[PDB]
Amino acid sequence: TRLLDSEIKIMKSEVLRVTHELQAMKDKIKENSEKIKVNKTLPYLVSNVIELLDVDPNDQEEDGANIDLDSQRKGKCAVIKTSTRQTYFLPVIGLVDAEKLKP
């Protein structure tokens, strides 16, 4: 049978997407990293880690009213002691990888 080029008519569609995705992501990283940077004002407190905990979701769940933090956490969590003698539980560690901490 006589061949035909019908393949390209489907194949070519993805290019218009991907050429813009590869640019849009490397655009957004600019604003995203600056939005992180502008948060980090240097007057930090200082404080000591007291504990590292292994956390497991609850037995039961809900919608219309569920919390991202009670269930629906699965990694590590921490407990820290501030200088001004507070003790805080932390549900999300933050901008440091939990592997490198120890009490």
């Binding site: 569609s13 218009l16 997407r17 813009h20 995705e21």
Partner: protein, 76 residues
């Protein structure tokens, strides 16, 4: 072409578009028409969500189809 998009309020809007337009251009036209920001509004068609990354032909939006608009609902 002409396209009809209607909202949870009962107000309805008609847009002019060409098949090569992307969703983002739709939302921009809506903002021009009404002042809602492009990040707030969500669109629905044929019971599945729209997303940017695609042309209006790609979802097979035909002449005089109807779209649903629904707002971002945030509070805190």
């Amino acid at each position: 072409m002409q396209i009809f998009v209607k909202t949870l309020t009962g107000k309805t809007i008609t847009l002019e578009v060409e098949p090569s337009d992307t969703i983002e251009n739709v939302k921009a036209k809506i903002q021009d028409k009404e002042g809602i920001p492009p990040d707030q509004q969500r669109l629905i068609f044929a019971g599945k969500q729209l997303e940017d990354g695609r042309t209006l032909s790609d979802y097979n939006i035909q002449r005089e189809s109807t779209l649903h608009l629904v707002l971002r609902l945030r509070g805190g």
